[PDB]
Amino acid sequence: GTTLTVDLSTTYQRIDGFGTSEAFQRAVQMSRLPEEGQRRALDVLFSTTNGAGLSILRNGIGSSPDMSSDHMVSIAPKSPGSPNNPLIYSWDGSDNKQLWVSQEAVHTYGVKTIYADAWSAPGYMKTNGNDANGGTLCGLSGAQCASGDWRQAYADYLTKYVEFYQESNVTVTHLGFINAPELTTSYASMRFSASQAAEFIRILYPTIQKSNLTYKPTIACCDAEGWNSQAGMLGALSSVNSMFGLVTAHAYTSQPGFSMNTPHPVWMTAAADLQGAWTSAWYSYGGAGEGWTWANNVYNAIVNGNASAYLYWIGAQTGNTNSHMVHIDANAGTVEPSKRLWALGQWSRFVRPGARRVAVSGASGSLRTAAFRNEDGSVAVVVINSGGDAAVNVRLASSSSADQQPASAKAWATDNSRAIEEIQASFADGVATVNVPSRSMTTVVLYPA
Amino acid sequence: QAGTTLTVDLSTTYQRIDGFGTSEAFQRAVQMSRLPEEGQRRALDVLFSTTNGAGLSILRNGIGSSPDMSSDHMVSIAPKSPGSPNNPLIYSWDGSDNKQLWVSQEAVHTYGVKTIYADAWSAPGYMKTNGNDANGGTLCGLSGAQCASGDWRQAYADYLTKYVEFYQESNVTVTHLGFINAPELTTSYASMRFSASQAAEFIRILYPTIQKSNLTYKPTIACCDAEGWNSQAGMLGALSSVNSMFGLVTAHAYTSQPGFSMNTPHPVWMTAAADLQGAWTSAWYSYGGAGEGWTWANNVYNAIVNGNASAYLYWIGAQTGNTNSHMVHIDANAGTVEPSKRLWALGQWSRFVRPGARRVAVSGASGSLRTAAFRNEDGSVAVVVINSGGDAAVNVRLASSSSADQQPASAKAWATDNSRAIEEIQASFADGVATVNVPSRSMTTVVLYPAADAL
Ligand SMILES: *[C@@H]1O[C@H](CO)[C@@H](O[C@@H]2O[C@H](CO)[C@@H](O[C@@H]3O[C@H](CO[C@H]4O[C@H](CO[C@H]5O[C@H](CO)[C@@H](O)[C@H](O)[C@@H]5O[C@H]5O[C@H](CO)[C@@H](O)[C@H](O)[C@@H]5O)[C@@H](O)[C@H](O[C@H]5O[C@H](CO)[C@@H](O)[C@H](O)[C@@H]5O)[C@@H]4O)[C@@H](O)[C@H](O[C@H]4O[C@H](CO)[C@@H](O)[C@H](O)[C@@H]4O[C@H]4O[C@H](CO)[C@@H](O)[C@H](O)[C@@H]4O)[C@@H]3O)[C@H](O)[C@H]2NC(C)=O)[C@H](O)[C@H]1NC(C)=O
Numbered sequence: 001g002t003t004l005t006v007d008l009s010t011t012y013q014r015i016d017g018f019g020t021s022e023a024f025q026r027a028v029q030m031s032r033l034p035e036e037g038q039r040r041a042l043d044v045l046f047s048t049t050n051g052a053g054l055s056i057l058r059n060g061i062g063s064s065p066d067m068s069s070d071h072m073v074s075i076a077p078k079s080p081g082s083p084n085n086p087l088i089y090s091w092d093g094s095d096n097k098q099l100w101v102s103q104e105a106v107h108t109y110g111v112k113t114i115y116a117d118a119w120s121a122p123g124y125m126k127t128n129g130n131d132a133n134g135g136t137l138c139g140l141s142g143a144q145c146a147s148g149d150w151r152q153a154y155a156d157y158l159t160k161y162v163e164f165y166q167e168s169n170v171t172v173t174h175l176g177f178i179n180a181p182e183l184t185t186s187y188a189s190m191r192f193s194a195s196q197a198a199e200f201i202r203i204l205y206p207t208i209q210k211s212n213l214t215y216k217p218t219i220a221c222c223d224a225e226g227w228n229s230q231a232g233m234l235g236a237l238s239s240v241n242s243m244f245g246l247v248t249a250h251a252y253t254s255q256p257g258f259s260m261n262t263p264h265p266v267w268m269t270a271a272a273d274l275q276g277a278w279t280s281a282w283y284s285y286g287g288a289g290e291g292w293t294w295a296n297n298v299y300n301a302i303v304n305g306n307a308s309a310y311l312y313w314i315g316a317q318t319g320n321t322n323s324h325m326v327h328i329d330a331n332a333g334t335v336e337p338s339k340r341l342w343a344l345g346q347w348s349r350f351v352r353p354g355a356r357r358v359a360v361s362g363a364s365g366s367l368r369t370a371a372f373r374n375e376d377g378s379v380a381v382v383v384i385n386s387g388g389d390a391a392v393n394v395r396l397a398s399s400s401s402a403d404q405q406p407a408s409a410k411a412w413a414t415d416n417s418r419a420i421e422e423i424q425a426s427f428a429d430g431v432a433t434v435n436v437p438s439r440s441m442t443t444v445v446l447y448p449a
Numbered sequence: 450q451a452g453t454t455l456t457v458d459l460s461t462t463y464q465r466i467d468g469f470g471t472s473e474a475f476q477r478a479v480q481m482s483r484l485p486e487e488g489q490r491r492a493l494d495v496l497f498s499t500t501n502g503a504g505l506s507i508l509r510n511g512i513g514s515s516p517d518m519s520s521d522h523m524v525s526i527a528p529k530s531p532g533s534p535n536n537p538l539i540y541s542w543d544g545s546d547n548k549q550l551w552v553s554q555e556a557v558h559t560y561g562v563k564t565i566y567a568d569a570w571s572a573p574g575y576m577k578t579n580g581n582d583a584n585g586g587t588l589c590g591l592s593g594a595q596c597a598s599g600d601w602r603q604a605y606a607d608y609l610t611k612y613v614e615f616y617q618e619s620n621v622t623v624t625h626l627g628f629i630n631a632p633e634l635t636t637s638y639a640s641m642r643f644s645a646s647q648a649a650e651f652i653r654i655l656y657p658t659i660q661k662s663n664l665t666y667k668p669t670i671a672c673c674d675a676e677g678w679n680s681q682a683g684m685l686g687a688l689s690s691v692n693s694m695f696g697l698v699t700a701h702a703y704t705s706q707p708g709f710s711m712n713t714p715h716p717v718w719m720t721a722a723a724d725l726q727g728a729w730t731s732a733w734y735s736y737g738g739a740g741e742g743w744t745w746a747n748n749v750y751n752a753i754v755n756g757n758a759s760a761y762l763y764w765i766g767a768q769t770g771n772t773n774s775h776m777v778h779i780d781a782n783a784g785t786v787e788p789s790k791r792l793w794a795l796g797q798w799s800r801f802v803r804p805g806a807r808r809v810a811v812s813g814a815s816g817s818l819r820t821a822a823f824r825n826e827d828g829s830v831a832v833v834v835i836n837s838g839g840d841a842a843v844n845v846r847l848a849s850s851s852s853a854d855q856q857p858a859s860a861k862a863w864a865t866d867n868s869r870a871i872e873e874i875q876a877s878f879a880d881g882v883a884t885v886n887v888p889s890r891s892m893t894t895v896v897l898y899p900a901a902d903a904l
């Protein structure tokens with residue numbers, strides 16, 4: 001059959017993980033389910049044995065005065081009157097139900113990567129006096145305010161949000177201070193040029209470093225709405241590459257189809273079929289909402305976009321568009337996972353944080369392949385099969401060390417009939433033989449003893 | 450103060466008490482079986498008799514993991530590997546289970562025990578990363594434990610189910626089932642290392658295996674018999690995803706004490722404690738030392754009132770040897786059995802606080818008295834009085850708020866102390882109030898009985 005030979009001596013990017021968000025009170029929607037529904041939603045998102053095994057949670061650092069509509073209330077919703085005054089913190093022990101989701105992810109399911117991102121400063125820190133409708137942080141170049149220079153205050157505020165999480169037994173590992181900085185919206189939004197982002201990183205970095213935080217989070221930038229948009233910010237960011245450690249971008253205004261010129265890992269932090277009528281299907285005709293489509297979208301972001309992580313926009317939510325992976329039926333108190341959840345899971349269950357992408361060769365026409373060596377030495381080989389059932393042999397290169405060689409193998413597939421379902425893996429003399437199902441994503445894993 | 454009045458408020462309730470007990474694992478049951486017939490009967494009586502012994506209501510058995518009965522090892526029902534987990538397991542039943550089946554049959558059919566907790570300390574060696582039931586190692590096929598020989602997770606679930614079926618076919622119902630013991634500890638004897646995450650992983654496999662089995666009674670899954678409260682409490686977060694698939698939290702009292710309530714929806718049992726290394730003593734009170742009956746009466750109190758425990762098991766019941774690892778001493782040469790006052794301390798609880806009792810509020814204790822109260826399923830109310838002072842005149846009553854048909858029509862009392870082993874004392878009863886002289890340095894239990902069916 002087809003023989004796929006993994007070359008562990010040819011390496012690419014590290015994989016930090018896969019995930020999603022419950023921002024904008026999507027966590028509050030989850031919190032209103034019955035106990036059994038809450039548990040099923042958390043399980044299908046985070047379970048490493050019986051769900052998607054998502055390894056990254058992205059939270060919003062709320063900017064709004066209250067929890068009206070779907071707004072994320074800020075930890076400091078009321079102005080202290082001057083940026084020279086201590087901020088007025090009113091920690092509610094909830095953070096828009098994101099603290100609960102985070103505690104479950106970390107303490108119940110073993111998630112270790114928590115990305116907190118502000119879509120805006122509080123309104124009193126901004127040129128327009130409002131967390132919505134754009135505007136900029138007071139005190140940046142070209143943004144003087146009568147009320148004062150709020151740059152250090154905003155750095156102190158973000159540091160305090162991370163401290164509140166720490167005191168609630170959750171370590172925020174990555175910290176963002178803008179989202180879609182190129183776009184004014186009717187909801188939480190804030191306009192920074194790439195230059196202003198560099199200016200603010202020079203203030204935020206020493207604030208974190210001098211803080212009493214147990215773990216100093218890595219600063220991220222800038223959650224632009226597409227690859228091209230974020231790539232256009234990298235020149236101005238290059239002066240501060242010693243002071244941040246993660247580039248973030250979405251997949252809306254352009255696709256993750258090229259390697260960005262940055263020394264940092266690059267995460268694709270939001271993608272979705274936002275407008276698409278709800279479908280739970282794996283494959284029907286290759287539509288934009290189909291699980292098969294999203295298995296390939298992830299492949300493309302990793303192999304062509306050089307992404308180290310891939311986050312779907314929203315995990316569990318109500319509504320009937322493909323903006324989310326897991327449908328909440330608030331009436332029945334029920335939870336329905338789409339095959340998009342299982343697409344992201346077919347990746348995340350087997351390609352764990354700290355994996356290194358490695359060369360695989362031998363694929364035929366109708367197979368797209370990628371390989372990853374996990375920190376534990378397990379070698380996950382992804383096979384996306386656009387044809388009929390295919391006999392595939394998976395092995396390491398001749399030149400592989402005996403300590404890298406597998407003593408056992410397993411395989412799982414997602415297709416129309418399967419949700420990360422274990423399939424037979426014949427194992428003889430370092431070689432795993434699997435029948436990759438028609439129109440499936442199959443992951444074959446080679447385990448050392 | 451016409452004595453100290455203890456007033457029970459039946460409207461204020463706490464946890465249920467499932468019972469009190471011990472184990473005869475690691476061939477301690479074999480040591481009992483070697484006694485002359487009268488010695489066997491005396492050992493069984495002092496453990497289980499509800500009239501003339503400690504009335505222990507729970508037995509904890511080991512699910513043997515060893516390839517043979519060398520040393521004190523518990524031989525497995527499946528000591529020989531089938532080579533591969535695709536192959537049916539090879540069951541080699543000996544009709545004995547390291548003499549635990551006999552102790553169980555006597556407990557259930559002679560003495561009325563209804564709760565039988567079977568716990569594996571290891572899978573058989575051939576199912577593990579180290580190929581041995583001792584020296585730790587992990588079940589093959591769990592996350593972080595892939596084995597050349599295969600994935601033995603389903604096999605181990607099938608094996609545990611089959612152990613329960615062999616008991617069922619020998620007319621004993623296993624009510625509770627554990628699959629690890631001290632999962633944080635590697636030892637030179639039966640031992641197996643699981644993280645809390647691995648335990649949750651295995652529960653997701655074991656639960657449906659039990660539910661689809663042909664067992665007459667589906668036992669409740671327990672976890673995880675950690676060596677202390679702190680160690681077990683640290684496992685609860687990873688276990689919380691499978692709270693719909695198990696029903697009992699278990700922990701020991703070695704590496705920390707049962708001094709706080711665990712955050713779990715399940716009943717919590719303290720399934721092993723002992724003065725393991727203390728020189729044998731049979732005494733109730735000498736100075737408050739680690740082996741004394743008085744100290745163990747207080748350890749039970751603390752586990753129930755401060756630990757929120759629903760059950761309390763001493764490590765071993767009857768055993769040979771010269772330490773306080775056990776409650777009842779066997780002299781294999783004399784063929785004799787000698788209960789310590791630790792046996793009588795646990796019986797001073799278990800005789801009167803029967804399975805299903807609900808802990809209830811009691812007020813009025815003076816400085817020398819520690820008190821707790823329990824409403825039994827039959828409406829009888831057991832009031833424990835632990836008295837560190839001289840003889841204490843005490844009155845025991847229900848709160849005036851009580852329905853007149855909850856109010857006792859009779860009362861009895863028993864005490865354990867340096868001279869008494871669960872000995873009846875006077876409970877003078879007038880107009881719903883029991884009056885007792887609680888002896889110096891004793892544990893006394895006063896029971897208020899409603900009239901019930903009696904004219
Ligand atoms: C000290 O230790 C105590 C334990 O020893 C501990 O007590 C525990 O307290 C918590 C918190 O108060 C209690 O949690 C509540 O539980 C309610 C359900 O309780 C009933 O079901 C339980 C589980 O039953 C399963 O397991 C048993 C054995 O495994 C079986 O006997 C059962 O058949 C059943 O098995 C089935 O299900 C299993 C999975 O669960 C499955 O594996 C199995 O195969 C099978 O299919 C019982 O244990 C419990 O029994 C108690 O109560 C009965 C009746 O009084 C007694 O007779 C018993 O002796 C025993 O004491 C019950 O039968 C939940 O409903 C409740 O959740 C609701 O409320 C919360 C908020 O508190 C809401 O967030 C939630 O959404 C729920 O809301 C619903 O109900 C409310 C009504 O109040 C309503 O307003 C709302 O709209 C909605 O409808 C909560 O989870 C827990 O039960 C206690 N345990 C026990 C054993 O009592 C105590 O806290 C400790 N103290 C301290 C200080 O820490």
Ligand SMILES: *[C@@H]1O[C@H](CO)[C@@H](O[C@@H]2O[C@H](CO)[C@@H](O)[C@H](O)[C@H]2NC(C)=O)[C@H](O)[C@H]1NC(C)=O
Pocket residue numbers: 012013014259260261262263264265266306308
């Ligand atoms: C893909 O992304 C990785 C980062 O995830 C890039 O790795 C960097 O490569 C440069 C140039 O060789 C090194 O000096 C950096 O130290 C690397 N960063 C890390 C964190 O490893 C890699 O260059 C990217 N690939 C392409 C084709 O652009």
Ligand SMILES: O=C[C@H](O)[C@@H](O)[C@@H](CO)O[C@@H]1OC[C@@H](O[C@@H]2OC[C@@H](O)[C@H](O)[C@H]2O)[C@H](O)[C@H]1O
Pocket residue numbers: 024070183187225250252253270274
């Ligand atoms: O510029 C026009 C484009 O269509 C954008 O609006 C798209 C792609 O860049 O942007 C996306 O719009 C929808 C956003 O979702 C919402 O977030 C706020 C919340 O209150 C709403 O309920 C959501 O619909 C998404 O964040 C954004 O990337």
Ligand SMILES: O=C[C@H](O)[C@@H](O)[C@@H](CO)O[C@@H]1OC[C@@H](O[C@@H]2OC[C@@H](O)[C@H](O)[C@H]2O)[C@H](O)[C@H]1O
Pocket residue numbers: 475521638676701703704725
């Ligand atoms: O880590 C060191 C500690 O002292 C542990 O050894 C203690 C308390 O955690 O653990 C206890 O050690 C003795 C064990 O009893 C033995 O069980 C196996 C049997 O073969 C032996 O004869 C017994 O001594 C006890 O189970 C354990 O809790």
Ligand SMILES: O[C@@H]1[C@@H](O)[C@H](O[C@@H]2CO[C@@H](O)[C@H](O)[C@H]2O)OC[C@H]1O
Pocket residue numbers: 049050051419420421422
């Ligand atoms: O490894 C396999 C798991 O991936 C599988 O998980 C299931 C995925 O589909 C969901 O609908 C189920 O709830 C979940 O259990 O279970 C089998 C296991 O071998």
Ligand SMILES: O[C@@H]1[C@@H](O)[C@H](O[C@@H]2CO[C@@H](O)[C@H](O)[C@H]2O)OC[C@H]1O
Pocket residue numbers: 500501502870871872873
């Ligand atoms: O109710 C009382 C029993 O608890 C008591 O049991 C005795 C306890 O001490 C043991 O040494 C004896 O063998 C045992 O009979 O017996 C008297 C009864 O009133």
